[PDB]
Amino acid sequence: FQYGNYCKYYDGRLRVLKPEWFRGRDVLDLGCNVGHLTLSIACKWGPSRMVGLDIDSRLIHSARQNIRHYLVPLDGADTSVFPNNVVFVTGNYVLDRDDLVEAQTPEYDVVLCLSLTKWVHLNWGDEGLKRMFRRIYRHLRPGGILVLEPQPWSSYGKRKTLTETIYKNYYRIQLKPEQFSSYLTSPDVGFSSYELVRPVYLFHKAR
């Protein structure tokens, strides 16, 4: 469970997230896990498109089986209403090179990156996390928002001995959680502004 990839059930987060951010918008949920939040938002708040992405296919299978527990669209040609507005995909959001990140064209209005930063940081280092952040920016359409819930540096130490890669990265990291807001709003990423809503932040892409 080196990617934090075990089945996590909590959702209290819907009290902090605002429905207006999601209604009629295209949403990408990074590290969706078993997709309880993906399904709750997709159902309760009507996004036009909701995609849940996770590296672990066992979580994606479970997420797809969970659709039945949440159960109206007119038929298959109507993808505007739950359950026809949600899909799950297995994949690593972290691209290998910077030239690959630059090939990403916009597709979403909202990107949810909740409790993911630590797992990405430990497994793929500063380089990998910078690439995830830059990809989120490039994937968002002008006017888009990134919902970020990062883990504090204090959380990194515990289980730094999971992998040899995780250990080498824990001692090589220079971009610390406390510096994430400044990095995301820098020319390296591009976000125009940020705000505070673990703590939850909103990063804005210029219209």
Q: Which residues are annotated as a binding site for S-adenosyl-L-methionine?
A: 10, 13, 31-33, 54-55, 92-93, 114
Q: 40 or 92, CB closer to ligand SAH?
A: 92
C-alpha distance from residue 18 to each of 71, 87, 178, 195, 197 (Å): 23, 22, 24, 14, 10
Q: Of 40, 80, 92, 104, which lies in the binding site for ligand SAH, with binding defined by CB under 6 A?
A: 92
Q: Of 79, 80, 104, 115, which lies in the binding site for ligand SAH, with binding defined by CB under 6 A?
A: 115
- Give the length of the chain: 207
| 53 interacts with ligand SAH by CB under 6 A | yes
Q: How far is CA 171 from the centre of its chain?
A: 25
Q: 57 or 193, CB closer to ligand SAH?
A: 57
Contact 55, 78 (CB under 8 A): no
Amino acid at 113: C
- The dihedral through the CA atoms of 12, 17, 20, 26 has a sign that is negative
| 54 interacts with ligand SAH by CB under 6 A | yes
Contact 2, 166 (CB under 8 A): yes
| 133 interacts with ligand SAH by CB under 6 A | no
Contacts of 197 (CB under 8 A, 6+ apart): 16, 17, 147
| 5 interacts with ligand SAH by CB under 6 A | yes
Please report how close the Cβ of residue 114 comes to ligand SAH at its closest, in angstroms. 4
Q: Of 27, 33, 82, 121, which lies in the binding site for ligand SAH, with binding defined by CB under 6 A?
A: 33
Please report how close the Cβ of residue 8 comes to ligand SAH at its closest, in angstroms. 5
Q: 13 or 79, CB closer to ligand SAH?
A: 13
Report the DSSP pairing between strands 49-54 and 26-30. Answer: parallel
Q: What is the size of the binding site for ligand SAH (CB under 6 A)?
A: 19
Of 8, 18, 3, residue with least CA distance to 66: 8
Residues near ligand SAH, by CB under 6 A = 3-5, 8, 31, 33, 53-56, 59, 92-94, 114-116, 119-120
